[PDB]
Amino acid sequence: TDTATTPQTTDAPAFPSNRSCPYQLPDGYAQLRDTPGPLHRVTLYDGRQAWVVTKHEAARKLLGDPRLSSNRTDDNFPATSPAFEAVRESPQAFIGLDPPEHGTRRRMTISEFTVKRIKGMRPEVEEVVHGFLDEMLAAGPTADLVSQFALPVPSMVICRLLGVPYADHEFFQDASKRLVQSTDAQSALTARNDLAGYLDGLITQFQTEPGAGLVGALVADQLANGEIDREELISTAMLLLIAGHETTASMTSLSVITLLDHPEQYAALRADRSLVPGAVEELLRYLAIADIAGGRVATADIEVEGQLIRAGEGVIVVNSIANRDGTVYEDPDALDIHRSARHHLAFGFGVHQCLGQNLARLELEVILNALMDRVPTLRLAVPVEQLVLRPGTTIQGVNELPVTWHHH
């Protein structure tokens, strides 16, 4: 059988790409960033072509365009790995809904994420952060920052918000990781079913004995009024549980790696804590850990600066690339905790903009202040070159981060 004997250059490169450095664009993404025009063709894992959005203002425009639907069950939604077919087959939380249905479900959860509520959560967050730090610092001279700090902290916080008992954390933390990091459909489906069966039992328990937290409130109110389906409640709680776990944990580990590679800026941050909120925004822009959250499908033709998105085409708004748009962020590939990182897209834009964004901002501020206060000598226990980054088909991050510090 004959083989390929011609040049292999394509104008639709394979997407997504994997990071080789935790805080820099994959080489292929830098190329997309540099090509003029808002859109570029890519080839997804199964050979199907899709569009990516690579510029900041076009990304805002298209995330705001109701002709780009968030319906993951659509046959033309841009799947980036075989594991996505698990979500195409499963019931949908409001992240997969379009207006008006999106708003009726999202509004059932917003009361837990208001600015006033986030402010009232600071003592619990600080207590949780410092508690896990107490344990880690006492347990040995080295640690895995991920399993001992980065993951348990947001896990405990989101479980309190939801009413999910932390006694079961080994089970649902493992199931959350399996679902988010699954590479095939069968392991994704099993992880989803594991969480679904758990949450289903929690719902019945709350119907017997009304419970705390957001799940308790949805059971007692919207579910008892038929305003949400039981299966929808499960999907909604599952989305909040997984996002509340995995996103902040990834930001924590990648922020530590990044700050230790920029010691001048880390030292400036320690000397002036009023810089921490701005540094968190810059880290969000720079690390942009959730490109997998940009998929859309066109329900009508859309004209974009001379290019045409046709009805039925998949579109991925790649916020990591849009966040490196030099017409918005001067010298976009430089970390600068003093820059204005305003208007970044790490949380999206428009009706689906991250519900948890200010909880995440609170958590990362408390976490960075606590690391600088309690472990100012924190350092990586292995070279950055020995770390293993997750692939571009999931939330960016590291699954293990060996660290050490000065003893007690």
Binding residues (CB under 6 A) for ligand DIF: these are: 87, 95, 179-180, 239, 242-243, 246-247, 290, 292-293, 395
48 contact partners, CB below 8 Å, separation of at least 6:
78, 314
Backbone angles phi, psi at 68, to 5 degrees: -100, 100
Residue 356 binding ligand HEM, by CB under 6 A? yes
Residue 51 three-state SS: strand
Binding site partner of 292, from ligand DIF, ligand HEM, none, Cβ cut-off 5-8 A by kind: ligand DIF
Handedness of CA 322, 328, 330, 335 (dihedral sign): negative
Query: Which of 179, 289, 321, 341 contacts ligand HEM by CB under 6 A?
Result: 289
How many residues lie near ligand HEM (CB under 6 A)? 25
Cis peptide before 82 (omega within 30 of 0): no
374 contact partners, CB below 8 Å, separation of at least 6:
130, 133, 137
Binding site partner of 375, from ligand DIF, ligand HEM, none, Cβ cut-off 5-8 A by kind: none
Residue 80 binding ligand HEM, by CB under 6 A? no
Cβ nearer to ligand DIF, comparing 218 with 293: 293
Do 164 and 195 form a contact (C-beta atoms < 8 A)? no
Query: Which of 318, 359, 372, 398 contacts ligand HEM by CB under 6 A?
Result: 359
Relative orientation angle of helices 230-260 and 152-162, to the nearest 10 degrees: 150
d(CA 395, CA 209): 36
- Read out DSSP for 275-318? GHHHHHHHHHHHH---GGG-EEEESS-EEETTEEEPTT-EEEE-
Cβ nearer to ligand DIF, comparing 19 with 339: 19
Residue 366 three-state SS: helix
Query: Tokens 């709350």, residue?
Result: 206
Site string for ligand HEM, 85-124 (x = CB under 6 A): ---------xx----------x------------------
Cβ nearer to ligand DIF, comparing 17 with 393: 393
Number of residue whose CB is nearest ligand HEM: 356
- Nearest approach in angstroms of CB 150 to ligand DIF is 15
- Nearest approach in angstroms of CB 255 to ligand HEM is 10
Residue 217 binding ligand HEM, by CB under 6 A? no
Query: Which of 164, 243, 302, 371 contacts ligand HEM by CB under 6 A?
Result: 243
Do 398 and 254 form a contact (C-beta atoms < 8 A)? yes
- Which pairing describes strands 295-298 and 314-317: parallel, antiparallel, or unpaired? antiparallel
Q: Is 159 annotated as a binding residue?
A: no
Binding site partner of 248, from ligand HEM, ligand DIF, none, Cβ cut-off 5-8 A by kind: ligand HEM
- Read out DSSP for 235-283? HHHHHHHHHHHHHHHHHHHHHHHHHHTSHHHHHHHHH-GGGHHHHHHHH
Closest CA to 129 of 368, 387, 380, 357: 368
- Nearest approach in angstroms of CB 87 to ligand DIF is 5
d(CA 52, CA 30): 13
Query: Which of 53, 108, 240, 257 contacts ligand HEM by CB under 6 A?
Result: 240
Site string for ligand HEM, 319-348 (x = CB under 6 A): x--------------------------xxx
Binding site for ligand HEM (CB under 6 A): 70, 94-95, 106, 158, 239-240, 243-244, 247-248, 251, 289-290, 293, 319, 346-348, 352, 354-356, 359-360
- Binding-site residue numbers for calciol are 80, 192, 235, 292
- Binding-site residue numbers are 80, 102, 106, 192, 235, 292, 296, 352, 354
